[PDB]
Design a binder for this molecule. Structure first.
Ligand SMILES: *[C@@H]1O[C@H](CO)[C@@H](O[C@@H]2O[C@H](CO)[C@@H](O)[C@H](O)[C@H]2NC(C)=O)[C@H](O)[C@H]1NC(C)=O
Ligand SMILES: *[C@@H]1O[C@H](CO)[C@@H](O[C@@H]2O[C@H](CO)[C@@H](O)[C@H](O)[C@H]2NC(C)=O)[C@H](O)[C@H]1NC(C)=O
Ligand SMILES: *[C@@H]1O[C@H](CO)[C@@H](O[C@@H]2O[C@H](CO)[C@@H](O)[C@H](O)[C@H]2NC(C)=O)[C@H](O)[C@H]1NC(C)=O
Ligand SMILES: *[C@@H]1O[C@H](CO)[C@@H](O[C@@H]2O[C@H](CO)[C@@H](O)[C@H](O)[C@H]2NC(C)=O)[C@H](O)[C@H]1NC(C)=O
Ligand SMILES: *[C@@H]1O[C@H](CO)[C@@H](O)[C@H](O)[C@H]1NC(C)=O
Ligand SMILES: *[C@@H]1O[C@H](CO)[C@@H](O)[C@H](O)[C@H]1NC(C)=O
Ligand SMILES: *[C@@H]1O[C@H](CO)[C@@H](O)[C@H](O)[C@H]1NC(C)=O
Ligand SMILES: *[C@@H]1O[C@H](CO)[C@@H](O)[C@H](O)[C@H]1NC(C)=O
Ligand SMILES: *[C@@H]1O[C@H](CO)[C@@H](O)[C@H](O)[C@H]1NC(C)=O
Ligand SMILES: *[C@@H]1O[C@H](CO)[C@@H](O)[C@H](O)[C@H]1NC(C)=O
Ligand SMILES: *[C@@H]1O[C@H](CO)[C@@H](O)[C@H](O)[C@H]1NC(C)=O
Ligand SMILES: *[C@@H]1O[C@H](CO)[C@@H](O)[C@H](O)[C@H]1NC(C)=O
Ligand SMILES: *[C@@H]1O[C@H](CO)[C@@H](O)[C@H](O)[C@H]1NC(C)=O
Ligand SMILES: *[C@@H]1O[C@H](CO)[C@@H](O)[C@H](O)[C@H]1NC(C)=O
Ligand SMILES: *[C@@H]1O[C@H](CO)[C@@H](O)[C@H](O)[C@H]1NC(C)=O
Lengths: 43, 111, 415, 49, 95, 49, 49, 45
């Protein structure tokens, strides 16, 4: 899914759906993860 | 009460209001040790997970097979390192399997 | 060319699940629950019960076949000598420890205590493995004592003793490092070996995930069993999930359809379990076959297959049992402290092009030397040490130099 | 539950009783008169209440 | 239904392949066991020839020729490759 | 004995599958999507999805 | 859907066998020189890319 | 003493043509004090 329609998906769940931090990737958008320009080994 | 499934694990007696627990009664699969019809016709039965010549093993209750002290590269598998066979001297004997002949290699630092 | 001046002997663990629990379920009990008035109906579905029981029994015997193939590689069991003078190598961490009621090794004990699953239900049962953990440990001890005390010979004929420093000299020579590298550093080698071996224990104690490849297997089986038994709670569209309720509330002519729904649902669930178990048993059989191949080609010998036995050049691997699996401590010689010299493909003496016999030409800036390809050990370049072929005009990268003729001084002295 | 061995001539030549003894129980389970050496699973038993 | 993306993008897989390939070119087989250490390529091919039981000189004495064949062979496969990939087409078609 | 006197370095391909498309299907919405009435009935089958 | 999942399990097991063969082939042919006869291409092996 | 190939017993007099030199007689552990016959001496004599 795209980051535009994410919120449509208690208060904590609402916050996570909305997202103070939103990142868009090939595997759809994710919330709660800070995106960096660094790079590490897969975790 | 109940177990992981809907089967009842415990019940309260409606007459005396006493607690009780229920367990399925003695059951299990049954197998038989046969050395081959074309070589004999006696057979020794084995109850897989029941508590009981007669003989007891970690693999179940084996009757009709006579225990013997020593061990041989075993013919057929019973379980828990116990095998049986019509060898030895005209009946099924159940023993503990032997792995191989002892062989201490004569090791020394200059040989 | 950059070639090593030092080495490190590193032992790396490799886990391999060789078998799984021998579960069996009697279709009749699981589906009907000992309700004869329901077994009579189940009999109308054909030979499904017999087929499922046959499949599960096949998997059960295949597990014991897997264990037999992987571990029972030796026709006879060997006993390590009482005296433990292996030339400085210290195997106390892999060999069985008599100081415990069980005949395991400290690594084996730690390995076994780090994997964990009495539960009984209706129909489901588990058969004990053919080779009890004590017997698997005895087989492992046999293989381990054989490899320590008789090199690789015990796996391909009679057990021919050989002093362990000499055995490791042979194993070194098997990877292109001359024998004199080992003896002249024997003590050092031993220390590294010992250290590495000790280190492995801490690694097994480092995280719970070390035994993951085994744990997963167990977990998977458990999951399946759970989701099978839990399927008895579902009713599959009937009016109740318990056959007793059906037969107590409804008369036979009407209860027949509800029992039909329950029979169909239970049979489908058990069929799904059996098929998943067949796939999983095929995967475990492949893993056990790979484990048997590793035990045959690594413990009983020394493989040129580059990464079959962990990073580095394989020297020897000692097996260790583990609950439903095996663990190999692949010992590997790994180069280190590489120094880079200038190199040439061939030297010239009097127009004759000398190529190294087995080593390689390397120059420490000033004059050349011949050194084996995996451990910097410069030797004066001599006609005995390097062979001849062709002449100057053909090779590209040739470098002028003088190759010592070993007979010149004696020839001059005696003529 | 009898297991009867017919013949190419069409005439019953021998029979085996499923419950006479464990050996015959296997002979019924394998659906063959001849039972090879080994360990055979035949049935599952429960203690009657 | 959906199809999840692979962990390693085609770019990352290509990078892995290029790393392996450059390691093979510039270090022979050593990078696969311990630390990668350089060795001139014709000398590495001499090592491999020795591996198959043909003495070192047989390479150098005609190194040029060897190289040419190698190059030609590589070119050929490309032309042969643009003919197949049935082993992968079969997988994708089956799925 | 026949001895070689020349060589012809050859290069040969070998294709090998390594992974298939990672597909994933919702059972709940595949059997019946956006229909609570059928989802309730499907819940009877238990943990098949 | 159950049929599709079972067939996918079989197919993925086949692909996993192929991937294991590819892994060993890369290990033994690329990262080294192999004595196995037809493993790394027909003929005597020199090196694989 | 003798030099014999592994995995088959074929003794051969220890000679400079089947042994390679190293060390100084102090680093290796467990050496022995036997001698190596040199093929060149009989030719010289
Ligand atoms: C090869 O490396 C080993 C270590 O891996 C070296 O041995 C070490 O030498 C230092 C010298 O002060 C000691 O402090 C260490 O305790 C030694 N370690 C071990 C494990 O013995 C060895 O000297 C190196 N050899 C060469 C030629 O450089
Ligand atoms: C071989 O290794 C064992 C350990 O696996 C050594 O035994 C230990 O030695 C240390 C140091 O003296 C003691 O603190 C420990 O209590 C000993 N036992 C254990 C279980 O660690 C042993 O000394 C080493 N050498 C020989 C010749 O056995
Ligand atoms: C290079 O290797 C030589 C070994 O030969 C090192 O030792 C010198 O070698 C030359 C001739 O071989 C002698 O004349 C010197 O007396 C040797 N020096 C010593 C201290 O024994 C040499 O040191 C190495 N390094 C260089 C830069 O030549
Ligand atoms: C290596 O030695 C050869 C032979 O001594 C050198 O080749 C000669 O170089 C001289 C230079 O004037 C020519 O006149 C000769 O015709 C060459 N051939 C012979 C057979 O003498 C060569 O130059 C030296 N150096 C190198 C890098 O090869
Ligand atoms: C997501 O929405 C943004 C904003 O309209 C658009 O630019 C982008 O292309 C969209 N991506 C996908 C994958 O739909
Ligand atoms: C990271 O890279 C992006 C590239 O577009 C850039 O915009 C951004 O400022 C960089 N730093 C951070 C903290 O994102
Ligand atoms: C009924 O059961 C209760 C509970 O035990 C008991 O106290 C009472 O005497 C019983 N009455 C009769 C008539 O049995
Ligand atoms: C049940 O098993 C235990 C442990 O093996 C044994 O001590 C006991 O005698 C058994 N009882 C019967 C009735 O078989
Ligand atoms: C071994 O034989 C002796 C003598 O018959 C007997 O007392 C003992 O119980 C036997 N041991 C086993 C394990 O059968
Ligand atoms: C060794 O490598 C370094 C760079 O890695 C280079 O500067 C140096 O010249 C090399 N040594 C020789 C002898 O070529
Ligand atoms: C490569 O090395 C050879 C070795 O002698 C030398 O003759 C040649 O000139 C070198 N080529 C380059 C381009 O440096
Ligand atoms: C039995 O088989 C024989 C074979 O020759 C045949 O002659 C005979 O008619 C068959 N039937 C009876 C009843 O004998
Ligand atoms: C080997 O074959 C090549 C290719 O035709 C040829 O150029 C070369 O001369 C041949 N070698 C010999 C010794 O004839
Ligand atoms: C072997 O051990 C003895 C002590 O029993 C010792 O004297 C001898 O030097 C040792 N030799 C070797 C080669 O280990
Ligand atoms: C070997 O001989 C040398 C010199 O002859 C002597 O110093 C040494 O002690 C001898 N070693 C033995 C073990 O006899």
């Amino acid at each position: 899914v795209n980051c535009t329609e994410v919120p449509v998906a208690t208060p904590t769940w609402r916050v996570y759906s909305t997202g103070s931090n939103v990142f868009q990737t090939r595997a759809g958008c994710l919330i709660g993860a800070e995106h960096v320009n660094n790079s590490y080994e897969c975790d | 009460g109940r177990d992981i499934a809907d089967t009842t694990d415990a019940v309260r007696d409606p007459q005396t209001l006493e607690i009780l627990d229920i367990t399925p009664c003695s059951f299990g699969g049954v197998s038989v040790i046969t050395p081959g019809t074309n070589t004999s016709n006696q057979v020794a039965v084995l109850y897989q997970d029941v508590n009981c010549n007669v003989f007891q093993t970690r693999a179940g209750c084996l009757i009709g097979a006579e225990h013997v002290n020593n061990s041989y590269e075993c013919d057929i598998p019973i379980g828990a390192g116990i095998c049986a066979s019509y060898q030895t001297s005209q009946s099924i004997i159940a023993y503990t399997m032997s792995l191989g002949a002892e062989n201490s290699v004569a090791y020394s630092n200059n040989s | 060319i950059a070639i090593p001046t030092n080495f490190t002997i590193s032992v790396t663990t490799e886990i391999l699940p060789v078998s799984m629990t021998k579960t069996s379920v009697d279709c009749t009990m699981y589906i009907c629950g000992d309700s004869t008035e329901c077994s009579n109906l189940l009999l109308q579905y054909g030979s499904f019960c017999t087929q499922l029981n046959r499949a599960l029994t096949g998997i059960a015997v295949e597990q014991d076949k897997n264990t037999q193939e992987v571990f029972a590689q030796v026709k006879q069991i060997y006993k390590t000598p009482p005296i433990k003078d292996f030339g400085g190598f210290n195997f106390s961490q892999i060999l069985p420890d008599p100081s415990k009621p069980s005949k395991r090794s400290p690594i084996e004990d730690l390995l076994f205590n780090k994997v964990t699953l009495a539960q009984k239900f209706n129909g489901l049962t588990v058969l004990p493995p053919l080779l009890t953990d004590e017997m698997i440990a005895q087989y492992t001890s046999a293989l381990l004592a054989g490899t320590i005390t008789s090199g690789w010979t015990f796996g391909a004929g009679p057990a021919l003793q050989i002093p362990f420093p000499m055995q490791m000299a042979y194993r070194f020579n098997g990877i292109g490092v001359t024998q004199n590298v080992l003896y002249e550093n024997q003590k050092l080698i031993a220390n590294q070996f010992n250290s590495a071996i000790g280190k492995i224990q801490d690694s097994l104690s480092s995280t719970p995930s070390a035994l993951g490849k085994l744990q997963d297997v167990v977990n998977q089986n458990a999951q399946a069993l759970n989701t099978l038994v839990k399927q008895l709670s579902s009713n599959f569209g009937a009016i109740s999930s318990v056959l007793n309720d059906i037969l107590s509330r409804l008369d036979p002519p009407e209860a027949e359809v509800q029992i039909d729904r329950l029979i169909t649902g239970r049979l489908q669930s058990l069929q799904t379990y059996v098929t998943q178990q067949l796939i999983r048993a095929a995967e475990i059989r492949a893993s056990a076959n790979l484990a048997a191949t590793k035990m045959s080609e690594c413990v009983l010998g020394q493989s040129k297959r580059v990464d079959f036995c962990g990073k580095g050049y394989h020297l020897m691997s000692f097996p260790q049992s583990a609950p439903h699996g095996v663990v190999f401590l692949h010992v590997t010689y790994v180069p280190a402290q590489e120094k880079n010299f200038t190199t040439a493909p061939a030297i010239c003496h009097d127009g004759k092009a000398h190529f190294p016999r087995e080593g390689v030409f390397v120059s420490n800036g000033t004059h050349w030397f011949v050194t084996q390809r995996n451990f910097y050990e410069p030797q004066i370049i001599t006609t005995d040490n390097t062979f001849v072929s062709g002449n100057c005009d053909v090779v590209i990268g040739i470098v002028n130099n003088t190759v010592y003729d070993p007979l010149q001084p004696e020839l001059d002295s005696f003529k | 539950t009898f297991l009867l061995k017919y013949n190419e001539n069409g005439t019953i030549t021998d029979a085996v009783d499923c419950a006479l003894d464990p050996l015959s129980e296997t002979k019924c389970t394998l659906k063959s008169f001849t039972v090879e050496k080994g360990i055979y699973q035949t049935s599952n038993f429960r203690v009657q209440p």
